[PDB]
């Protein structure tokens, strides 16, 4: 990946084949890090499990995806959102209380 980055649809198909081992590798790459590649990845992920992968990769996209899916589960989502953010928090709290 890093090699070719430094034929985009080809890579899209390769990653298509990749999609558990692939996810682990991605997690590893993100940990190591801590454009085109990023966008392609985001698109493939957008194509529970989904939300998690999206969040992990983006580490705003996470929050947006979670909110969309929400639009036990509710509590978990609101909670995850609040922790990530730490207006939005107040709204989430009010919703959970309502």
């Amino acid at each position: 990946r890093l090699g070719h980055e430094c034929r985009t649809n080809f890579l899209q198909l390769l990653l298509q084949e990749d999609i558990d081992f692939f996810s682990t590798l991605l997690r590893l790459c993100n940990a190591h890090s801590d454009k085109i590649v990023d966008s392609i990845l985001s698109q493939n992920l957008r194509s529970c499990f989904k939300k998690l992968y999206c969040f992990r990769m983006l580490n705003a996209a996470a929050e947006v995806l979670y909110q969309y899916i929400l639009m036990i589960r509710k509590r978990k989502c609101y909670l995850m959102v609040i922790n990530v953010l730490s207006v939005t928090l107040t709204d989430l709290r009010d919703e959970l209380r309502g």
Partner: protein, 36 residues
């Protein structure tokens, strides 16, 4: 204001696609980190 800032950042990124560029540069935080 934050939205406008993000838009400006996106526009700058589009324009880029050395010293002057560095001068111009000087979730949003995550993006900045990825850029660096």
């Amino acid at each position: 204001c934050c939205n406008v800032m993000s838009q400006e950042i996106v526009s700058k990124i589009l324009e880029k696609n050395k010293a002057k560029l560095l001068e111009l540069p000087l979730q949003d935080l995550m993006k900045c980190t990825y850029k660096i």
